[PDB]
Design an enzyme around this catalytic site. Structure first.
Site, PDB file in Angstrom:
ATOM      1  N   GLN A  70     -40.054 -53.637  39.317  1.00  0.00           N
ATOM      2  CA  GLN A  70     -40.302 -54.673  38.314  1.00  0.00           C
ATOM      3  C   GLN A  70     -39.783 -54.492  36.890  1.00  0.00           C
ATOM      4  O   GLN A  70     -39.839 -53.411  36.309  1.00  0.00           O
ATOM      5  CB  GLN A  70     -41.801 -54.963  38.255  1.00  0.00           C
ATOM      6  N   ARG A  71     -39.322 -55.612  36.342  1.00  0.00           N
ATOM      7  CA  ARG A  71     -38.757 -55.734  35.000  1.00  0.00           C
ATOM      8  C   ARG A  71     -39.658 -55.336  33.824  1.00  0.00           C
ATOM      9  O   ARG A  71     -39.380 -54.376  33.106  1.00  0.00           O
ATOM     10  CB  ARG A  71     -38.324 -57.189  34.791  1.00  0.00           C
TER      11      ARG A  71
END
Ligand SMILES: Nc1nc2c(ncn2[C@@H]2O[C@H](COP(=O)(O)OP(=O)(O)O)[C@@H](O)[C@H]2O)c(=O)[nH]1
Ligand SMILES: [N+]
Length: 176
Positions: A70-71
């Site tokens: 995830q970012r």
């Protein structure tokens, strides 16, 4: 009694050494952690999706987590970078399909301002497997020889058998 590596270490540092053990899931980080220390593992979750395994042993503080994913959880990773003394990056030498991905993740880590000048040991893990890619080729594939802004070393190892792990830690101790 059947000694962990951080304890066997000769010429071990004087100050507490903060180590980050990173790499893709399944690289062998938990297995490596257990070869290094026998102390109980703390499980910390600073934010959802960020799962850390932490251990304090023989003058070493280790934090382990899977990179990639995830970012929005980068700011949380960065808080740990600031006080990191050594980066140990683990790669599953037999997972050719994800070599490109892990190489990109490493490249991005070495671009992090908070990790400036931090020595990096790359463990080419699972070398006991007959499917493991050669360490010399992994090094070229990761473009390790282009690294000028920090000292580095690549070490062939098997977290399973323990082979090569101490040799890698010996390099870490010489570059703290
Ligand atoms: N053959 C072999 N298997 C390993 C080695 N290190 C880890 N593994 C295996 O790889 C899998 C993932 O290891 P693990 O430590 O949990 O990975 P982590 O996701 O990076 O924490 C497990 O099935 C391990 O037993 C190794 O050096 N050699
Ligand atoms: N090269």
């Amino acid at each position: 009694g059947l000694l962990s590596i951080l304890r066997k270490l000769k010429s071990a540092p004087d100050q507490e050494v903060r180590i980050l053990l990173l790499g893709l899931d399944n690289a062998g980080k938990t297995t490596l952690l257990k070869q290094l220390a026998s102390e109980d593992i703390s499980h910390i979750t600073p934010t959802q999706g960020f799962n850390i395994k932490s251990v304090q042993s023989q003058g070493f503080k280790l934090n382990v987590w899977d990179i990639g994913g995830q970012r929005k959880i980068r700011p949380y990773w960065r808080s740990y970078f600031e006080n990191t003394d050594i980066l140990i990056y683990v790669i599953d030498s037999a997972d050719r399909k994800r070599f490109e991905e892990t190489g990109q993740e490493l490249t991005e880590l070495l671009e992090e301002e908070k990790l400036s000048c931090v020595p990096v040991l790359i463990f080419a893990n699972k070398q006991d497997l007959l499917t493991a890619a050669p360490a010399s080729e992994i090094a070229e594939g990761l473009n390790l020889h282009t690294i000028r802004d920090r000292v580095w070393q690549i070490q062939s190892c098997s977290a399973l058998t323990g082979e090569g792990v101490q040799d890698g830690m010996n390099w870490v101790c010489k570059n703290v």
